[PDB]
Amino acid sequence: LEYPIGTPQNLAGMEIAAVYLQPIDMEPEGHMRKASESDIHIEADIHALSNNPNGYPEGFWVPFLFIKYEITKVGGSGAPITGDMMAMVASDGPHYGDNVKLQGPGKYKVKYTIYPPNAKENPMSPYYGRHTDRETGVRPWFKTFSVEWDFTYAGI
């Protein structure tokens, strides 16, 4: 049970999909905006495609990424809604998500900015490596990229 935001986009051997669902509760406490003060839990579902250049087998979750989002109401007066997702696990597996408060029903544009593990902006840079030798190594990390979709929200 989830609500898709547009259709998934394929880049650098990965599938990037955007979805939302009801606000959630998460451990550790204090990271997510409280469910009672949110409208949705927005998610980025990122999985490896066949022949992924960073060594992930097809269908694997791509871990240690850092995702920033920008949600803008189309024809709205208000400014965009921005934030950072957090890596986490739910009953459907690991993902990147965040509890968001929107600006009522209507048309929205959503932009995700996806940072690789080595990006300056990624706080997980010192904790994740990549083999670089010819025998066991992989291609360099993909470069930071943005993906966008349109969606209509009505209250869930």
- The one segment of 48-56, 58-66, 90-98, 103-111 that binds Cu ion by CB under 5 A: 90-98
Contacts (Cβ under 8 Å, ≥6 apart) of 99: 23, 24, 32, 33, 34, 35, 37, 38, 40, 41
- Give yes or no for residue 92 binding Mg ion (CB under 5 A): yes
**Min dist. Cβ of residue 19 to Mg ion (A):** 6
Write out the binding residues for Mg ion, residues 93-112 only, by CB under 5 A.
Answer: 95
Of 44, 58, 59, 32, nearest in space to 4 by CA: 44
Q: Does 13 bind Cu ion (CB under 5 A)?
A: no
- Count of residues near Mg ion by CB under 5 A: 2
- The binding site for its own copies (CB under 8 A) comprises 1, 21-22, 24-28, 31-32, 35, 54-57, 60-61, 63-64, 86-94, 118, 123-133, 135-138, 140
Provide the residue count of the chain: 156
Q: CB–CB of 100/33 below 8 Å?
A: yes
Choose from Mg ion, Cu ion, its own copies, none: what does 91 bind? Cβ within 5-8 Å by kind.
its own copies
Minimum Å distance from CB 97 to Cu ion? 3
Per-residue burial over 8-22, b if 16 or more Cβ lie within 10 Å, else e, is: beeebbbbbbbbbbe
CB 95 within 8 A of CB 80: no
Q: Which residues contact Mg ion by CB under 5 A?
A: 92, 95
